[PDB]
Amino acid sequence: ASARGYVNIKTFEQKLDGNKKIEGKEVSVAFPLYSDVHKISGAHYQTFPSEKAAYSTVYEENQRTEWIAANEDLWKVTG
Amino acid sequence: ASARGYVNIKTFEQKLDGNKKIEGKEVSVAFPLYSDVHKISGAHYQTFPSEKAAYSTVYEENQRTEWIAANEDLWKVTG
Amino acid sequence: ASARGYVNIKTFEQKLDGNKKIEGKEVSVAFPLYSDVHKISGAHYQTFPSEKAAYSTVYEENQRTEWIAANEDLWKVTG
Amino acid sequence: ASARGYVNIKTFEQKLDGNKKIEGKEVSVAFPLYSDVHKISGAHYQTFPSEKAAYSTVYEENQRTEWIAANEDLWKVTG
Amino acid sequence: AYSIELTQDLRAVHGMDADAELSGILATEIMLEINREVVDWINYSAQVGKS
Amino acid sequence: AGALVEIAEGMATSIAELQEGFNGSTDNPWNEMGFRIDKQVIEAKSRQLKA
Numbered sequence: 491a492s493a494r495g496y497v498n499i500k501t502f503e504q505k506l507d508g509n510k511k512i513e514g515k516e517v518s519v520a521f522p523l524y525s526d527v528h529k530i531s532g533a534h535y536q537t538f539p540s541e542k543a544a545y546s547t548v549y550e551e552n553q554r555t556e557w558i559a560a561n562e563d564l565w566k567v568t569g
Numbered sequence: 570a571s572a573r574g575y576v577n578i579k580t581f582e583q584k585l586d587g588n589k590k591i592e593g594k595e596v597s598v599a600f601p602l603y604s605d606v607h608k609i610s611g612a613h614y615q616t617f618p619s620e621k622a623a624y625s626t627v628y629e630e631n632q633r634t635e636w637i638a639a640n641e642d643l644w645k646v647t648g
Numbered sequence: 649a650s651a652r653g654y655v656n657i658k659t660f661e662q663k664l665d666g667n668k669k670i671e672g673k674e675v676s677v678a679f680p681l682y683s684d685v686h687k688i689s690g691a692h693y694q695t696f697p698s699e700k701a702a703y704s705t706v707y708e709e710n711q712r713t714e715w716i717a718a719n720e721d722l723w724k725v726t727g
Numbered sequence: 728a729s730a731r732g733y734v735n736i737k738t739f740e741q742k743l744d745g746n747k748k749i750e751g752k753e754v755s756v757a758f759p760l761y762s763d764v765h766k767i768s769g770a771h772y773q774t775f776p777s778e779k780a781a782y783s784t785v786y787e788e789n790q791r792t793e794w795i796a797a798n799e800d801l802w803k804v805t806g
Numbered sequence: 807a808y809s810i811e812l813t814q815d816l817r818a819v820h821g822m823d824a825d826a827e828l829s830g831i832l833a834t835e836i837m838l839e840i841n842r843e844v845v846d847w848i849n850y851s852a853q854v855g856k857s
Numbered sequence: 858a859g860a861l862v863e864i865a866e867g868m869a870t871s872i873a874e875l876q877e878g879f880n881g882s883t884d885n886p887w888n889e890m891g892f893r894i895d896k897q898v899i900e901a902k903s904r905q906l907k908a
Contacts, residue, residue: 532880534884538869538872
């Protein structure tokens with residue numbers, strides 16, 4: 491487990507362009523990893539801490555490059 | 570007729586989620602029925618008073634439980 | 649060519665009603681034409697000057713009544 | 728329905744002349760119609776308000792010219 | 807665009823302002839970039855030497 | 858029986874800080890309160906006798 495805290499980012503999907511979306515993604519982050527690296531701003535989200543991970547997408551103490559690719563994936567634009 | 574006045578609510582639909590809508594509805598309400606119970610807030614409307622019903626959907630002096638169901642249904646989320 | 653300047657207007661497409669769009673329109677305009685008559689306000693655009701026309705739809709020194717109809721065309725409602 | 732109140736006029740018939748009458752008429756009137764036009768005086772009547780029309784013949788919010796013909800027809804002389 | 811919840815606790819723990827620390831890095835950052843600009847025009851606008 | 862207990866708590870200052878569209882967040886408005894002011898109406902009814 492993370493053993494500390496879970497910062498839980500839930501992005502809310504939206505229509506960016508014609509027949510295109512930025513898919514909203516429920517994701518959880520181990521708190522020490524989150525405070526170190528998070529790119530989220532202007533991303534149409536809302537965040538809350540929780541003792542246990544509150545979303546089915548869970549990132550533990552050690553991922554880094556696995557998570558660094560997931561947060562910038564919150565901006566992925568799909569049709 | 571209501572014989573008092575009609576508060577005409579014109580709601581403008583938006584895209585809530587991926588390929589989904591919160592349906593906009595043009596509706597008239599008897600002004601005493603409107604003043605008593607009206608749920609409109611944050612519903613992206615425009616309201617004006619009128620002497621005669623300005624929209625096809627009309628709620629006269631006595632509906633209440635029919636209208637009270639309709640004004641909350643301005644938030645209906647459809648696929 | 650206009651040989652002077654071009655005002656490039658890129659209007660972003662928004663969902664005006666259910667399944668009804670305001671088409672996103674890339675357009676360039678000869679600067680002395682855009683200065684004379686330009687209707688753009690609240691059109692959800694972003695504008696930049698240029699040396700050459702930066703978009704494919706170009707309205708040169710002489711169109712006028714074709715551009716006068718084309719900038720108010722930026723509000724067209726497409727089904 | 729008038730939705731407000733009904734002024735109920737019950738006229739008692741009488742013998743006006745030799746083998747003649749002014750016949751009695753049980754009628755209800757929407758109160759905002761009753762205040763506007765009521766010809767009743769010396770008519771040998773009695774009046775009470777009520778929330779629901781207490782008599783069979785009812786004149787709602789809008790008759791007017793159909794009631795105005797009726798109230799002064801309380802003086803119709805019959806044989 | 808700093809936060810109102812920040813200056814409450816930051817100024818409580820660190821005693822810093824949290825405004826003049828942002829106003830200090832914006833007003834500085836435009837004065838550095840304007841200054842990096844011309845020295846990036848001189849080297850942009852300069853002929854090729856030793857030619 | 859203690860299974861389902863009754864609590865009240867506050868707002869994590871991660872949430873409270875950005876509330877109603879700060880730092881790019883969305884969908885989280887503040888709560889609000891109004892007041893109403895309606896009225897009642899009474900009417901005098903007569904009464905009477907004779908001898």
